[PDB]
Design a protein around this ligand. Sequence first.
Ligand SMILES: [Mg+2]
Ligand SMILES: [Mg+2]
Ligand SMILES: [Mg+2]
Ligand SMILES: [Mg+2]
Ligand SMILES: [Mg+2]
Ligand SMILES: [Mg+2]
Ligand SMILES: [Mg+2]
Ligand SMILES: [Mg+2]
Ligand SMILES: [Mg+2]
Ligand SMILES: [Mg+2]
Ligand SMILES: [Mg+2]
Ligand SMILES: [Mg+2]
Ligand SMILES: [Mg+2]
Ligand SMILES: [Mg+2]
Ligand SMILES: [Mg+2]
Ligand SMILES: [Mg+2]
Ligand SMILES: [Mg+2]
Ligand SMILES: [Mg+2]
Ligand SMILES: [Mg+2]
Ligand SMILES: [Mg+2]
Lengths: 58, 69
Amino acid sequence: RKCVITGKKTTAGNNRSHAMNASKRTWGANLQKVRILVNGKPKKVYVSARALKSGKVE
Amino acid sequence: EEEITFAELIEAGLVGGEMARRRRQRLGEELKIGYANGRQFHKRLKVFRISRDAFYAALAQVMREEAGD
RNA sequence: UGAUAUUGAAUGUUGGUACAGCUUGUACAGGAUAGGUAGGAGCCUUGGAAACCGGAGCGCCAGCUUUGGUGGAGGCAUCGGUGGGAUACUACCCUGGCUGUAUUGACCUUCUAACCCGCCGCCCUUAUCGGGCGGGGAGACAGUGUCAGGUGGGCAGUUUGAC
RNA sequence: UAGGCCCAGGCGACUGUUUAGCAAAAACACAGGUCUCUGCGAAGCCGUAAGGCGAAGUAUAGGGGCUGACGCCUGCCCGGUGCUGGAAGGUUAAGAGGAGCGCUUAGCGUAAGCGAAGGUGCGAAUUGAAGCCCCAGUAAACGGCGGCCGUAACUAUAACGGU
RNA sequence: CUACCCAUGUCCAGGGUGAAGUUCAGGUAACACUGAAUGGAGGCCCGAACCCACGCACGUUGAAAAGUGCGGGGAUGAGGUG
Ligand SMILES: [Mg+2]
Ligand SMILES: [Mg+2]
Ligand SMILES: [Mg+2]
Ligand SMILES: [Mg+2]
Ligand SMILES: [Mg+2]
Ligand SMILES: [Mg+2]
Ligand SMILES: [Mg+2]
Ligand SMILES: [Mg+2]
Ligand SMILES: [Mg+2]
Ligand SMILES: [Mg+2]
Ligand SMILES: [Mg+2]
Ligand SMILES: [Mg+2]
Ligand SMILES: [Mg+2]
Ligand SMILES: [Mg+2]
Ligand SMILES: [Mg+2]
Ligand SMILES: [Mg+2]
Ligand SMILES: [Mg+2]
Ligand SMILES: [Mg+2]
Ligand SMILES: [Mg+2]
Ligand SMILES: [Mg+2]
């Protein structure tokens, strides 16, 4: 699970409360699924919403 | 014997536009019979067999909430 | 449970953002209830004008050089303007207002290309997986990502004084 | 080789299951009863997700809670808590919205200070969901079924009247 | 090993009791029913194999790190077992 264009992933980090007591946690990447041309073949893959902002076709 | 007539729904202001759409969108749920069009609303009134007086009472009610009950 | 991205189109109702317009200056005062600084006398006559009321203007409505109507055929500047202006025009501008404009949002619908279908037909193929092409259903919702608020012994880490 | 029997009570209806190795039962289970959730990709459950069980079932079905054959029955209380439902109002985050105020310096400077643009901080009003505050129902839901004074035997049955 | 589940096999000497139904009769209004014959149901009865573990005694550096002896319970089923 990762964007096929920019290669974003999901990372790990803490999660603080009011009293700063830590605990593990994860950070998703806002991926979407769209039919897209790839290496001369159309396909539906994962791609981040940020990449979709500009400079891409569907 | 048709406790309510179609002309009653007509005069109630239940014909198209936006105000009448709000009228039905309110009245229906106030009677627990969901949404409909004019004819569909009349048919629902008929099938659930609801009494005229309660219909008028809810009518006045929703007009009051429209007028700020 | 909200905001925000994915996330589109057409409405309608809608609050405003500026454009465009003609506007009452009521002061207990000038014949008279004639703004703000103002150049200031020159204009108007077959704009039935000036006497004039309301219909741009306020209103217990009085009248206004603007103004559809009979109210008919000159005042103002110049005339005690009690005046906190003396006004041809108004070089510039404001309250009485809505329209078309640029709107922007918020609602209320509608639609269809997004996204979804443990629906159907055909193909890959001998396959209840999968995806490819058609149909259908829903549809900018839902699902998913980030942020926020509730609830939360369901599950964790701990405390519970001395004489 | 091969049933001691009878008369009374308590508990549990019955056959069954249970602490391998100190407890075999009155404990558990059960046929029946009742309450409640679930319109199908059902509810619930396992898994982070795919994927499954439920079920190749469809409310005469499935999950959960209490009670526990059969016969006679299950009284009063909705203030509190839980759950279900509703509207006038109050309170409430993130995000929008940014009034206004600081620091810095072109300039004026005159000696003190005032200080245009830009930058950089701080942020007013206005708006902003559920929940909570509130109201109604619900008890084979969690729960509750009193004190005083005067008045009737049997182990004072204080039954009965007044606060 | 033990707990529960899934697929596929297998084991239970012998004897009792006699449900439904059916057929006869009597019976009644036919019915209700009564009595015979047939029939062979059952988480039925008695009891070996098998499974379990209620009482007592013995053993307690044991024959055995949970047994033996004499009695006991279920034994066609919510069975036992490979
Ligand atoms: Mg991957
Ligand atoms: Mg740590
Ligand atoms: Mg949270
Ligand atoms: Mg704890
Ligand atoms: Mg520690
Ligand atoms: Mg001590
Ligand atoms: Mg028992
Ligand atoms: Mg027993
Ligand atoms: Mg034991
Ligand atoms: Mg015993
Ligand atoms: Mg024992
Ligand atoms: Mg039961
Ligand atoms: Mg299945
Ligand atoms: Mg019990
Ligand atoms: Mg009991
Ligand atoms: Mg009771
Ligand atoms: Mg038996
Ligand atoms: Mg045992
Ligand atoms: Mg023995
Ligand atoms: Mg027995």
